[PDB]
Amino acid sequence: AGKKVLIVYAHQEPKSFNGSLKNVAVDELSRQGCTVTVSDLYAMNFEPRATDKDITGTLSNPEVFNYGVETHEAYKQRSLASDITDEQKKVREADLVIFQFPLYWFSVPAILKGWMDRVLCQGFAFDIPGFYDSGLLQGKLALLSVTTGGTAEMYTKTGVNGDSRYFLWPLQHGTLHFCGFKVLAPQISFAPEIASEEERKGMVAAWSQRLQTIWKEEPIPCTAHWHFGQ
Amino acid sequence: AGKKVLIVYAHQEPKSFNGSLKNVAVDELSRQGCTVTVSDLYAMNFEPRATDKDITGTLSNPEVFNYGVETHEAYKQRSLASDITDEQKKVREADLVIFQFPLYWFSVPAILKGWMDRVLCQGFAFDIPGFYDSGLLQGKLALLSVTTGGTAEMYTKTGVNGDSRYFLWPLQHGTLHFCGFKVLAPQISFAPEIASEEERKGMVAAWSQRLQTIWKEEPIPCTAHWHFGQ
Ligand SMILES: Cc1cc2nc3c(=O)[nH]c(=O)nc-3n(C[C@H](O)[C@H](O)[C@H](O)COP(=O)(O)OP(=O)(O)OC[C@H]3O[C@@H](n4cnc5c(N)ncnc54)[C@H](O)[C@@H]3O)c2cc1C
Ligand SMILES: Cc1cc2nc3c(=O)[nH]c(=O)nc-3n(C[C@H](O)[C@H](O)[C@H](O)COP(=O)(O)OP(=O)(O)OC[C@H]3O[C@@H](n4cnc5c(N)ncnc54)[C@H](O)[C@@H]3O)c2cc1C
Ligand SMILES: COc1ccc2[nH]c(I)c(CCNC(C)=O)c2c1
Ligand SMILES: COc1ccc2[nH]c(I)c(CCNC(C)=O)c2c1
Ligand SMILES: [Cl-]
Ligand SMILES: [Cl-]
Ligand SMILES: [Zn+2]
Ligand SMILES: [Zn+2]
């Protein structure tokens, strides 16, 4: 309670394991008295493409379109498309942002990659300078709650996929820490589709139980050593 | 020559540095006598979202939508949407696939992430016995030609962004190698917007020159060691 949470959710099916993890987060955080908002990207038909339709005012350089330059200016002038503005309001108000999604090619599904590309624009999430520890979303927490097709054993240093932390780098360091977020430890629910029903219920319960004490957690040291070792 | 190349290109502006790199690749490979095709994703308004519209006709299980299962079955039953199958035909016929794009959040822009998510489906790009070395696109070459906002020095082990090889992992190993591609060394054009015109013409020239002998190259060893060294 006394906290606002935004859950950015990326799954097409309400009945899925991801849907259950999203619902258990809403239920638990709601029970605690926290304020909770969910951006259900597929239900919103959220636009993932970074295009000139994202700026509604006069372009800074109409001869040669530069998405980053134009969205930075549009943010400052308040001429960004309203879908982007609506998400920035949710992020601005949130104390914790949880991303709930199935891993697609060792990363986030494209609809959620689009949310990162379009919502986290210069001027809003970072500035030059004003990134990493000085990012604009400093003071906020972020957490990746990911599900995988591959097993935990495949995601180890000696497994075929390498350690799970390796693929977290672009997201935790390159994106969240770059924008100033303090990153909480990822929640990784391995291979639910081939797990037993008891194991799945167990993974949902472990997430619910973790959320009970989420506000007492410290963030991870978002560094190369944490992700890669040595 | 006697080779087919597909360039999957993700930039909004034809006059951009990315546009120039795409154009010299088409020019050089066409001069060599190679068969060249370009999927200009923004011009195609390529759909990035993984949804049930990707399957035509009746769904395998219309009570609980599972994208991976539905697209695997649709691939086997020849019922995938035409935008996806049009791209799969280009890939199937290609000997080399070059991805040309600006780095967005240490990864590919969402429209290109969408192409990977939707085009590289089970049955087409990978299957139970076929992945990594036995991936279904084995025999084909793939190459990432990336442009960055950050300077090369920022992309060093002690630079703020970390070694560039760190962010290449989900793309080169988790995606390309996983599908069976032999991965050629990435072409990284660091910070073209900050560079002088000479340094830029210099980077465009290095790319054109490299393409002259591209078929003489051996692929990189796509391992955790190559990426995280040490
Ligand atoms: C394009 C694409 C790319 C991919 N790339 C990767 C990759 O790089 N790496 C990788 O490892 N995987 C990858 N995958 C696999 C993907 O990560 C998994 O398919 C996904 O994580 C599974 O989560 P889900 O919610 O879709 O599962 P579900 O299909 O929902 O499976 C979970 C099962 O649990 C049941 N269930 C739901 N709620 C509950 C509950 N509360 N209690 C008990 N049971 C419940 C469901 O009915 C279901 O049978 C990819 C998939 C696609 C489509
Ligand atoms: C959403 C988003 C996320 C981003 N995330 C990251 C990130 O994680 N890491 C990072 O490092 N960067 C990031 N960036 C920055 C991005 O990677 C760079 O802006 C992009 O790579 C620059 O390439 P460009 O083609 O857009 O450049 P341009 O704007 O085209 O700059 C090159 C200059 O050269 C000119 N030019 C074009 N062709 C030629 C030619 N043949 N010869 C000479 N000059 C020529 C152009 O007109 C231009 O002035 C991000 C940007 C956005 C919008
Ligand atoms: C890098 O790893 C990837 C990449 C793409 C993938 N698309 C699907 I569907 C899966 C899950 C199938 N594997 C298992 C073990 O269940 C998958 C895994
Ligand atoms: C991790 O690094 C990122 C992340 C997101 C970014 N969005 C933009 I626009 C940039 C270019 C900013 N300039 C430099 C030199 O980096 C950018 C860089
Ligand atoms: Cl598999
Ligand atoms: Cl040679
Ligand atoms: Zn970090
Ligand atoms: Zn590899």
* Ligand 2 contacts CB of residue B130 (under 6 A): no
Closest ligand 2 atom to Cα of B189: 21
The full length of chain B comes to 230
- Say what the resolution is, in angstroms: 1.6
Label residue A46 exposed, middle or buried (CB < 10 Å: 0-12, 13-18, 19+): buried
Measured torsion, CA atoms of residues B14, B16, B22, B26, in degrees rounded to the nearest 10: 60
Phi, psi of A130 (to 5 degrees): 125, 60
What is the spatial distance between Cα B61 and Cα B55, in angstroms, rounded to a whole number? 12
Tell me the technique behind this structure.
X-ray
- List the residue whose alpha carbon is closest to atom 9 of ligand 4: A68
Short-list A112, A222, A127, CA closest to A176: A222
* Ligand 2 contacts CB of residue B151 (under 6 A): no
Phi/psi-derived region of residue A162, left when phi > 0, alpha when psi is between -120 and 50, beta in every other case: left
Class of domain B1-230: alpha beta
Residue identified by tokens 């291979």 is A191
Q: Is the dihedral of CA B204, B206, B208, B214 positive or negative?
A: negative
| B99 Cβ under 8 Å from any chain A Cβ | no
**Both structure tokens of B228:** 């995280």
Label residue B180 exposed, middle or buried (CB < 10 Å: 0-12, 13-18, 19+): buried
**What residues of chain B, 10 to 69, have a C-beta less than 8 Å from chain A?**
12-13, 15-16, 42, 45, 48-52, 64-68
DSSP letter for each residue of B147-214: E-SS-TTTTSTTSTT--HHHHHHHHIIIIIITTTPEEPPPEEE--TTTS-HHHHHHHHHHHHHHHHTG
Cβ A139 vs Cβ A96: under 8 Å: no
Measured torsion, CA atoms of residues B135, B136, B141, B144, in degrees rounded to the nearest 10: -70
Phi, psi of A73 (to 5 degrees): -65, -40
Residues in A touching B12 (Cβ below 8 Å)? 50-52, 65, 67
Cβ B98 vs Cβ B143: under 8 Å: yes
DSSP letter for each residue of A3-52: -EEEEEE--S-TTSHHHHHHHHHHHHHHHTT-EEEEEETTTTT------G
Residues in B touching A114 (Cβ below 8 Å)? 48, 110-111
Residue identified by tokens 């969408």 is B114
Residue type present at position B176: L
Residue identified by tokens 């039953």 is B77
Neighbours of A77 (CB within 10 A): 14
**What residues of chain B, 164 to 183, have a C-beta less than 8 Å from chain A?**
166-167, 169-171, 173-175, 178
